[PDB]
Curated annotation (Swiss-Prot):
One of its GO terms (cellular component) is extracellular exosome. This is Carbonic anhydrase 2. It is found in: Cytoplasm; Cell membrane. Changing residue 59 to H: Reduced proton transfer. Changing residue 61 to G: Impaired activity, not rescued by 4-methylimidazole (4-MI). GO terms for molecular function: arylesterase activity; carbonate dehydratase activity; cyanamide hydratase activity; zinc ion binding. Catalyzes the reversible hydration of carbon dioxide. Can also hydrate cyanamide to urea. Stimulates the chloride-bicarbonate exchange activity of SLC26A6. Essential for bone resorption and osteoclast differentiation. Involved in the regulation of fluid secretion into the anterior chamber of the eye. Contributes to intracellular pH regulation in the duodenal upper villous epithelium during proton-coupled peptide absorption. The gene is CA2. The active site is at 61 (proton donor/acceptor). Interacts with SLC4A4. Interaction with SLC4A7 regulates SLC4A7 transporter activity. Interacts with SLC26A6 isoform 4 (via C-terminus cytoplasmic domain). Belongs to the alpha-carbonic anhydrase family. Substrate binds at residues 195-196. It catalyses: hydrogencarbonate + H(+) = CO2 + H2O; urea = cyanamide + H2O.
Amino acid sequence: HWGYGKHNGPEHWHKDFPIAKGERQSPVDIDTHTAKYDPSLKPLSVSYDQATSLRILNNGHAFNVEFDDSQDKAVLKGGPLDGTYRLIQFHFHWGSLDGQGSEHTVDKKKYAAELHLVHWNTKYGDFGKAVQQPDGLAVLGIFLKVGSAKPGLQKVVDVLDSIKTKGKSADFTNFDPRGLLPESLDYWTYPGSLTTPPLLECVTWIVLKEPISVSSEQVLKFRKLNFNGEGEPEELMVDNWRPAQPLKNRQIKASFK
Ligand SMILES: NS(=O)(=O)[C@@H]1O[C@H](CO)[C@H](O)[C@H](O)[C@H]1O
Ligand SMILES: [Zn+2]
């Protein structure tokens, strides 16, 4: 099926998912000199105090840390968002080298990796219904650069050995996502889509200006994961990022000057 290889990568997705060449695809390059400061934007509210993590799974494309989204425990509000969005999972996109890995770029600059915290609009009842709506999801994107270690990320790094291959999952309770956030919540925002098939155009992207730092050792452990399932030939899980797409008829707004 779809993947990130030469024969099933991003360049091939449009054949099975024509929306890949749609009007509001992601990711995009954020040209800081074209983004418009919007003083009308409300303060961004990240309420992850009651976040309830459940499990970590290797899905063959990346690994997802899933949360219990049966109640308004961990939510995202404010900013360009109207209503309440519940956190359902987070995952990363990374490269084979430190100079690549992020999906969004800033003035064409690529970061080593990108964290995506996925939330769905509660007004729609469930995730499945939400992805069918133009304002169904809100994804918080955080860039990762190689430098000092990120304490809040080490817990995730410590369990990767237990989910090396596709299909593997491990218990991952009591994890605090607040430990993955940078100091500043300044951001850019624009209407976009999921960056992996089905590429649905249901996402309000909120990309933070300030990247978080992770150690070389931490990123290396991400690169030890496998795209393949147990027993199959090894294919290192690296470069699971989609390149920037045309901005077309869209404007990127900034929460800061
Ligand atoms: N990369 S992405 O747009 O957040 C994409 O979203 C999908 C729907 O939530 C799934 O979570 C994919 O795992 C994720 O990569
Ligand atoms: Zn993602």
